[PDB]
């Protein structure tokens, strides 16, 4: 019976202290990406020294950054940009290449 919107402020906005009124996020400073009840808009991400800016912040979408360079984001750690391995070690062949979303892939040359 009830809606996705129902009860909530729209994206690009945040709810007020008063529990009713919807206040707009500031383009560039902050953002809000879904029908929500956020007390404040989320601070827009600023791209890191070791990053490249693929999108600027809107009120409905956070800044999109990427490692680029010759580096990649590591998932198991904090999500930070490590430098890609240049080459595969001895006995192993390069099977994937350095992306912003991944280090090179090595695999055995079917030895041992």
């Amino acid at each position, epitope marked *: 019976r009830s809606s996705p919107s129902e*009860g909530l402020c729209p994206p690009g906005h945040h709810i007020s202290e008063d*529990g009713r009124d919807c206040i707009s996020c500031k383009y560039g400073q902050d953002y809000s990406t879904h029908w*929500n009840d956020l*007390l404040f808009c989320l601070r827009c991400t600023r791209c890191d020294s070791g990053e490249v800016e693929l999108s600027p912040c809107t009120t409905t979408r956070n800044t999109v950054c990427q490692c680029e360079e010759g580096t990649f984001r590591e998932e198991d750690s904090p999500e930070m940009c490590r430098k890609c391995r240049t080459g595969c070690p001895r006995g192993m062949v390069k099977v994937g290449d350095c992306t912003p979303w991944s280090d090179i892939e090595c695999v055995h040359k079917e030895s041992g």
Partner: antibody
Amino acid sequence: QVQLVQSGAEVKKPGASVKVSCKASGFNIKDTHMHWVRQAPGQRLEWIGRIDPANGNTEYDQKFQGRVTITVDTSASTAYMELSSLRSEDTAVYYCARWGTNVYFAYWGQGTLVTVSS
Amino acid sequence: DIQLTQSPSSLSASVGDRVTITCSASSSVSYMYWYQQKPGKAPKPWIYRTSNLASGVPSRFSGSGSGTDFTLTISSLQPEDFATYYCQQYHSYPPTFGGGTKVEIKR
């Protein structure tokens, strides 16, 4: 559309553990802390612990430290609480909830009847 | 922990009466949240941010309070209002609840 469906009522023996599920819909789990809360029969509400579902980062009350593991599955949009080495003292209604200093509203699960006896 | 002390434990009161429930705190608190739990049911959030009603809540209800002392007040009771009422604070870690005040009918 906002809902918090919890698991069915559990009957278990002392020492045995129990994993309680809490399935969320109609809002972003990641927005804020998911907490679990104990309520003994006709008694106080006791906060157990909280998880930041974006991080997976847990924090607990001293009473339950070492004995409760809260967890989340953002992809599934469901939170869980494992409680181990049970006692008759842990006979309670266990509630899953959402609240925080960054969101105005609070939503609560229906609760799970957990009984502990030999 | 900010320990919350709710007084009184219970209150036998009749329909149409003004009721004042207090919730004292062991240290100062920025905002206070009230819930209504009816027997065999999940707690319903009832008041947010000390004084703000939850949507669908009668105008007779009102929350108030400053630092360590807060009060829920019901200007004239009705049969829907007979339940246990808990206060909570989460602004200072960890979140803590009051021990509840059960409102019962006076006859």
